[PDB]
Amino acid sequence: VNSFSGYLKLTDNVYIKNADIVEEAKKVKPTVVVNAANVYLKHGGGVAGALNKATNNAMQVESDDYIATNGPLKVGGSCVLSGHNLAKHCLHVVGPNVNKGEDIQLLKSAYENFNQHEVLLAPLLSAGIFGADPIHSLRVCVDTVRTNVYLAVFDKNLYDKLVSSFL
Numbered sequence: 001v002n003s004f005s006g007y008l009k010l011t012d013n014v015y016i017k018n019a020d021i022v023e024e025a026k027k028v029k030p031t032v033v034v035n036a037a038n039v040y041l042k043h044g045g046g047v048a049g050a051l052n053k054a055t056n057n058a059m060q061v062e063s064d065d066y067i068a069t070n071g072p073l074k075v076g077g078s079c080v081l082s083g084h085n086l087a088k089h090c091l092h093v094v095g096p097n098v099n100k101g102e103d104i105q106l107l108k109s110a111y112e113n114f115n116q117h118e119v120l121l122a123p124l125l126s127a128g129i130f131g132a133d134p135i136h137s138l139r140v141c142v143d144t145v146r147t148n149v150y151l152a153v154f155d156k157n158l159y160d161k162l163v164s165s166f167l
């Protein structure tokens with residue numbers, strides 16, 4: 001049993017809810033919250049800007065030190081950093097950004113990072129401001145992630161379309 005409440009069950013391991021991942025994080029304090037990161041860990045807007053704002057910019061400060069030491073992530077890659085006030089850990093995952101012309105086939109590689117964690121609170125990768133089709137992102141999630149994932153969909157209209165269209 002875990003603390004996640006009000007989710008619709010899509011599969012054995014994937015759950016979904018219309019909610020802001022920042023607010024969900026503040027309530028649950030999950031072991032892992034996933035950030036919709038870019039390779040530079042520049043948390044300017046969407047899931048990343050909102051998560052970073054909720055940490056009072058401490059996520060950005062930590063991220064800048066990570067990049068100064070390690071250099072940029074790969075598209076499809078990830079790193080584990082602090083969850084600050086939101087979670088124990090933040091898994092920063094880089095889905096492909098369609099608005100930069102990145103290979104959508106990298107979305108499966110992105111979701112494979114989730115399999116290193118038994119339970120996660122996450123957004124739909126490459127969805128939101130990353131430009132991918134969220135229906136596609138949910139399908140890749142279900143077909144890739146084997147660990148237990150609690151998806152927070154910020155947009156109510158989109159949430160209802162993801163559920164209604166789910167095969």
Ligand SMILES: NC(=O)c1cccnc1
Pocket residue numbers: 020021022046047050128154
């Ligand atoms: N609060 C926000 O702006 C936001 C954007 C995308 C997802 N969740 C939250």
